[PDB]
């Protein structure tokens, strides 16, 4: 199995921006390939499903804050 995610790179947590679809097996694989594929410094990565539900986010050198 390979699941589909949406990797987004936004300015802050409550920003909307069109993201890029990946193909990943686990959520930890998505966090690894969202650790890279980040172009800028002071930005927030966000991992979502294909329908817009948030899964995790990371804000400029912190832990991945999981979204229960």
């Amino acid at each position: 199995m390979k699941a589909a995610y949406i990797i987004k790179e936004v300015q802050n947590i409550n920003s909307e921006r069109e993201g890029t679809q990946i193909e990943a097996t686990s959520l930890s694989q998505a966090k690894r390939i969202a650790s890279k594929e980040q172009c800028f410094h002071g930005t927030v990565m966000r991992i979502e499903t294909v329908n817009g539900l948030w899964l995790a986010y990371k804000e400029d050198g912190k832990r991945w804050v999981d979204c229960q």
Binding site: E9, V10, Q11, N12, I13, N14, S15, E16, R17, E18, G19, K36, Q38, C39, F40, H41, G42, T43, W54, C67, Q68
Partner: protein, 335 residues
Amino acid sequence: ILSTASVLAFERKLDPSDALMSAGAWAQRDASQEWPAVTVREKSVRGTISNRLKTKDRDPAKLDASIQSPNLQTVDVANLPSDADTLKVRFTLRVLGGAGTPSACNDAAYRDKLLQTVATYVNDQGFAELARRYAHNLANARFLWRNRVGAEAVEVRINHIRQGEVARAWRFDALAIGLRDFKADAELDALAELIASGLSGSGHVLLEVVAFARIGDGQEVFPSQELILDKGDKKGQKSKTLYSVRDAAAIHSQKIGNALRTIDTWYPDEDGLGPIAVEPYGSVTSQGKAYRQPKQKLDFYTLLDNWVLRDEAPAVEQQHYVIANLIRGGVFGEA
């Protein structure tokens, strides 16, 4: 013998309220009780993520495909009305007195030696230098933080309210009185000798402080910002929140008061960087450093342990920094 008291806590003197923002015309400043409040609104911003780039790929197609997706966002903004050019900022200040008495302590010998040290300060010279130093940060409108920058005039109006009624009034051109030098005036020494009487426990001091800052029609005013929790936590909308009280835009009562205690012009490694706020390990978040290190011997802890325990009374300008930290208040115990 004479270890430090493991619990020390001081209540704060000079407690201001939150300051509320209003708006009107500059020729209507004498009838400004019925000016409407500056409200916090919402607007949508979008911009390009143009931060500094991680050094993995210099290919043009990567950055060109990244900038095709914009960053959508909703912020809070506060503006003057388009027929109003003057911001009013109004708060009340209360100056308590009884500065050296702690609120919590353990040792009774340390507490009596501390009270006698602060009494031997106050009897030699009073609160005169510190009150002249606080009255300048009221007289210039330093508490207008970013609202002060680029104004045609700033007016400060101070009332002493001995009942509901006003006992004595003051008016200051806040831009003539600088933001660096503590130069002397007669009407400013009157306010200084009122603040020193309040600090010495003599009288009751409640000051009403009104500041008018002409900035121009419809211009953005700057209240204080709030943390983002409990405003959208799992899927949210707003990414910038401004502080309100009753949908009147406002500054927190600790950002004022931070501006009042910007006193400290005695800290070693400087030439002309200006006064900073009185803090133990005297530090600034914007410059990101402590101007008053413990590797040198100039901190509030290192001064106070020598001025109470070992009775090494410092230079009389450091005896303003220590008394200013005691007027500030705080948790100064071992933890």
